[PDB]
Design a protein around this ligand. Structure first.
Ligand SMILES: *[C@@H]1O[C@H](CO)[C@@H](O[C@@H]2O[C@H](CO)[C@@H](O)[C@H](O)[C@H]2NC(C)=O)[C@H](O)[C@H]1NC(C)=O
Ligand SMILES: CN1[C@@H]2CCC[C@H]1C[C@@H](NC(=O)c1nn(C)c3ccccc13)C2
Ligand SMILES: CC(=O)N[C@@H]1[C@@H](O)[C@H](O)[C@@H](CO)O[C@H]1O
Lengths: 395, 395, 395, 395, 395
């Protein structure tokens, strides 16, 4: 022999090599690949289309008896790079695929001198999962990635793990944070899927668990909803017989009705109807509608509509009571007949103004009482919302 | 002979193999492929472009007399993996294609020892279908997938099924739910398409039938439309001679006119005009316009416009009737001439106020009667809408 | 000889075959391809980018003297499938390309025993054309598809038709309807393009003619524009001295000014300015502005602004005329000096109210006359619009 | 010899041909390619991303001494088609690339009998350029396309032109018009780029110059801005003591403030701040704000706020002047004490009404004068805008 | 020997060359590649997805002992072009990849006569980085590009620099400006990443540092926020007892509440909550709400609500003080009983008007004082904003 270089090893073990055969001596022995996965980024979550988009780093090794050499008589070389398109590579795919993500190809693999061939590749994957939007900003999502051979059965290709599942689960080394989703764990699980008798497939199932960071939807949702309550609370201080109080309240209701629709496009809702945020917005609207209807009732109650006297059943029910329940406090005959008519024409205007003053007195007491009831209702709703947030926030 | 391995089988039957020929001994015998399909996901439905996007799992087998071996004298091997790019593969396409979906390639096939070669592959397909939007949230869609050989005729390539059509039709095993579309059935149908005499093609036609889940468009459509009726019903309680009732009603009409346009972009409408939802919105607007015109009529009827007396033809037509149809109830001479002028200057103001009070009395009776008629009309429309929904919802 | 199979024919005529040469015996004879096209779908029309996107079915045949065999002594085979990547294929492209559409490849062709090789393929094409938007919902579009060889000249590759042009023009067999565009005809035309002397190219030019279905833009354009006229016609019935009539009219003008802008994004306009729909909207706004200015004029005319008496030049011009043109109908001396001052303080208030009543009488007659003129103008515009639509609709 | 066909020429000169070598006999002689370009379409201009997208037609030829034959003894053939993937092709790229546009490949080239090999190909290119938006609808853009070899130096590959630069510059034969951009010229320029000593590269630089057609942004910008001035000019005719004049002006300011924001998204602005159109809109808003502030000043000046008498310093400054500057014009004693009190209670109401009438008289003269000043200011702005447009429009 | 050409060199050193082996004589010696990078364009920055998109120019060289020749006896050739797909190329990738950018391939490399093979290629790269939006328009971003071999270890492939790091850092020669991001420096850094013992990888880490040009978000943010303060300052000059002052203020608050939401979509916010711009907008709203509440307080204070006399505790607290703190200043008996009643009916109306005048006098002094306080608060906020901008702007 001689020494051209140590490309004569690669000449030795790729001369008569057939990349089509499953590389075993005895065909009864399965090829056992050993995989694991580290998660790199969560690229997209489509809650409408039920489609997850991540990016992982992937590696695998297997053993073949056709890529073996003694490490002596080749100047002590124990591993080398072989191009990927010249050896047998197993078809390990994902069941949950809905599309093909673009990922760089890696043109080389390692091969040790026992036949342990190692493959390293990054791969973008676009999978489909069931996403629960029962509670939109505070939600964990449990997505599956099932690695399986698409053709070969479990007596043909078998799948194990590279390393221990306790350290696959607790691995957050290169995950890109600051990206709306916190990784929690990547839990592997082995299952043998049998489609029927005598055809069973090896599957390795990774459960990724991600939690949404709720800080995004606390300035885009909680701020204008809490904000348009203080405009109501200021707008109750308008006197009801002005006329612009109704125009105030309907303008503010218009301003919030625009807000609900301009929010409801950027917040998805799938297979349930609405989350609890939709219930809290309906309660926020039910407060504002009765805030409007109270002003409509007082403006109806306080007007000049040639109306009758206030009822003494409901005068001492309301003025003497509500200051102690809550609040507190021959020609001379002709001239006589001419003057009596002028006195009568003035006293009826005087009486019709005193009736209006009594109804205006009833209306302000009611507008104070209903304002107290509304203020305590808004306060009791706000403390319920805070004490429901603090149960989540603590631990 | 000897024993290198059992790659010598693959050396035996791929040495002089030609992947260009249609692999039969007698050229008069057609190659019969046997296909079936399980549906995985409905990715998109473009009602505007009439384009469906699904993702299926696909499999097929056929027989070739060039891939046969005796299972003895090869150490009892009965099947093996052969790369896909080294054997003849039929060109089974879809007639309804409009684009190419990205799908992973599967580089291996099984080959049994009789020549039964099996191919498993997933494939994303983007097809075109006719979509009826006659009833937008409650609609089934009947889409076709016609598998056919694009070149070969029925004496050259023939298409059958893998398994029975009764179990292709009732197969929902891996379909991704929670995704706006329920699968109902995938019904296969064989047809021999003859383009003319002496050129006929085999076609296998799958009819997928999907039904939209109507829960999405019942919180984005039914909630604000039913919601802006209660603002009208509250807004009738304003007294009409205030002036802000008209400003209330036109603001609410503005608020719903924004709503119709901001909805009509996210709801498609194709080849029919509108669905029935568009008719129900036009009726919802026809109620609101007459709600506006009633207030315009009462505000015209109740004003101070130096107007004449109320007509006694229509005074006892309206006050004595509508409380029983529906509702219920030398210097002394100079001073005399000076005082009579002051009495005359006051009595005309008194008369012009009593005329205005009589017209204000007519206006409130009309505003009560028209409010009752409007409330019963809205109630009779709502119960018709409920009893049309309950026919769909039951069974 | 013997009988392996009839793959020995494909061994016979693809052994020493060179797929690079233009396959003729005499190099002076041109290769004549024969093409035709059936239209399948109109996928997109971008009026802004001037880009058409269709999907066609395409087929072609040509003759080569290197793929010939006698049908005897091969067990009577007269045609067979040959892979596409092993024979010469002409480069027939489109001049109007701006991009590459994704289309499935067809890996096989037929070859008859005279050398007639037939190719069938579907192809998505994205071309560029000039689109006229002079009349937006009622428009035909005349788009060209010029098939030509990109390199070879007319003494090298020549292009004819498969079948007669009278039956290419009248072919609507597989076109997908219900898709905003009706196909009308696909008219072929042969032209020899000479770029200069001694370099001429064969071109086959298909003119596709498509017509838009105008039903889409008759519920999204004609309905709110005709709708916001009846709100004006109702809003004239408000009495002008109320104060909320101006607030009515400016709110309705705001509501239509939002409508024009929220429509003008989804309706394109290219190289002309606007279509006639833009002129009809400007006339619709010119009616609404004079509807506003009439109310401004009457509200200016009817007010209490310490104004003078109505002019008798224009009192009998307007009250006696317009009911026949159109409408119809020592201490006693001290007390005397005290009372005369009170009479004088009342008679000036009486006079200042009678002046206001006379101006209020003029204002209502003008508000009736201008309402009649506006109603007849709107009616004369609507019948002109109907009689312009009916010329299009008939035949 | 014999005559199979004239594929024996292609057998002769592609038998031992190496497509990897730069095809020259003497390695010191550079390969001179000769290129030119005709512009077909301007597909997109992203002013935000500074990215141009065009579509050109491209051609080039070069000479190689390995593709030569005598035209005799091959039956007088002087040119033939050779596939592109079998000869040496230079790497001519563009420096300004930011992406890869999709373009059809052309699989054949011509080769003459001297070695002149001609290549024709269309190519979509996506380049980056500096875009000036100093004047948005009236702007020319000067974009560069630098053709260069990406690897080879000027003693290895050299670049010249096909034809004369005077006829490359004036070539508008197949450009697609009606597409928002007029082509003006495509000016070529040769530069030898030397990165350092002893490494210089040949570059051929095409300057495309395109001009925007300003007709698009004259109906979407100039029409509502000129339109909302006439609503102001009509709205000055409201009498200021009505109360709805302020509600008119703020509603119109709201309507234009919506307009500015809903325009400012579809008009880009990059590296300068704003164009001059942004300055003209700020002046359009500065007119409308002082139109609002004038009404606020008159409404403050005309009210009933228990105010004092008009100042005689500013009464003859304003009523006697502005009609010549611009505009034009024992018991009897008890009854006496009772009546004197009634006279005193009426004369103070009379005085407080005459004071209000004098302030109302001052307010109308000011509302006429400021309306004249505002009308002349709007007219002087409009004629300045017209005489700045007409300088551009003429020649 | 003879002279065909100098393609016999390429015949000499690519005849028995194996492109799969790592090209060294002694396998213990690592292949040292030498890279550097010049930055060309910043294509996109997604602050939501944390994804950077740039375009660089890249070059590298390495040494191989299999591509060596003596420059004599080949007619003095010292370098030549070899196709890329025929030699060994190292796999230098980026750790921060999330996708594959489209970049043109370069089909040739240089090879010198010592084996120094040089590779030039442009490459679009889409990477992921952490982006801080703590201060949105004034922010630098520190993004990493880690070049590493994806498979080979540091005894197999090693990475150095082409040129000195001081001139890689200060290199801005071909960067495309005018594009929202200024390049500052590209700083290289070498690190040996050891994943565990006996497996270490060579990494070359480039830190690109880019700064946003803040001029874009100073006309789209600072202009309407500073603009809607002057509308408030004008709107305080309305007299509070008019009624349209409240309708002014709530319309302006509506107009700014639309503005905040229509801005907040085009300005991202990630992992922090909000930048300081969000705090400045909340302060801008806190000024406008107290501007509204002041008008509500004065309108409540100034009305006719059958109210009592102004308190003398707070009359000399406010009228005598605030003009020195800030601002400045038998039948005759029957007729007697008839007249005394008329005097009494007038004097109570007189008293109820004088009470309203005293409250109107208090309200205007308060409306002046609060206007001065609000104007000084807005001025003190504006100068704080200017003196915080000028610290950034200086040097
Ligand atoms: C579509 O446009 C083409 C324009 O090229 C029309 O062109 C003419 O077609 C006739 C035959 O139909 C030729 O004889 C003329 O020479 C063509 N004229 C030109 C200027 O090219 C074609 O008729 C149009 N089709 C329709 C339906 O309008
Ligand atoms: C064709 N041209 C030739 C020289 C000018 C630009 C192009 C591209 C190419 N240049 C370059 O590739 C290039 N130049 N410099 C200074 C660099 C620094 C770091 C990385 C690459 C480069 C070769
Ligand atoms: C080489 C060979 O023939 N092996 C076995 C044979 O011993 C038995 C038979 C029964 O199935 O199966 C096979």
């Amino acid at each position: 022999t001689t020494q051209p270089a140590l490309l004569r090893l690669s000449d030795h073990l790729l001369a008569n090599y057939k990349k089509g055969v499953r590389p075993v001596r005895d065909w009864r022995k399965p090829t056992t690949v050993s995989i694991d996965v580290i998660m790199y980024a969560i690229l997209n979550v489509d809650e409408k289309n039920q489609v997850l988009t991540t990016y992982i780093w992937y590696r695998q090794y297997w053993t073949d008896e056709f890529l073996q050499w003694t490490p002596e008589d080749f100047d002590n070389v124990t591993k080398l790079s072989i191009p990927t398109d010249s050896i047998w590579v197993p078809d390990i795919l994902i069941n949950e695929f809905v599309d093909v993500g673009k990922s760089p190809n890696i043109p080389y693999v390692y091969v040790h001198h026992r036949g342990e061939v190692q493959n390293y590749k990054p791969l973008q994957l676009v999978t489909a999962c069931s996403l629960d939007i029962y509670n939109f900003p505070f939600d964990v999502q449990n997505c599956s990635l099932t690695f399986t051979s698409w053709l070969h059965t479990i007596q043909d290709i078998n799948i194990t793990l590279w390393r221990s599942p306790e350290e696959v689960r607790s691995d957050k080394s290169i995950f890109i944070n600051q990206g709306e989703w916190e990784l929690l764990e990547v839990f592997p699980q082995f299952k043998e899927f049998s489609i029927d008798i005598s055809n069973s497939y090896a599957e390795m199932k990774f459960y990724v668990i991600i939690r949404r960071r709720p800080l995004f939807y606390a300035v885009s949702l909680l701020l204008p909803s809490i904000f348009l309550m203080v405009v109501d609370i200021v707008g109750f201080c308008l006197p009801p017989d002005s006329g612009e109080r109704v125009s105030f309240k309907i303008t503010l209701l218009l301003g919030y009705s625009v807000f609900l629709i301009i929010v409801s496009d950027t917040l998805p809702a799938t297979a349930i109807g609405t989350p609890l945020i939709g219930v809290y917005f309906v309660v926020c609207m039910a407060l504002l509608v009765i805030s409007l209807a109270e002003t409509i009732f007082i403006v109806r109650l306080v007007h000049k509509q040639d109306l009758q006297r206030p009822v003494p059943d409901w005068l001492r029910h309301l003025v003497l009571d509500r200051i102690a329940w809550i609040l507190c406090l021959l020609a001379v005959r002709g001239l006589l007949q001419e003057l009596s008519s002028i006195r009568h024409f003035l006293e009826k205007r005087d009486e019709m103004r005193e009736v209006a003053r009594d109804w205006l007195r009833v209306g302000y007491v009611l507008d104070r009482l209903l304002f107290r009831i509304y203020l305590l209702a808004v306060l009791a709703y706000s403390i319920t919302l805070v004490t429901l947030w603090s149960i989540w926030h603590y631990s």
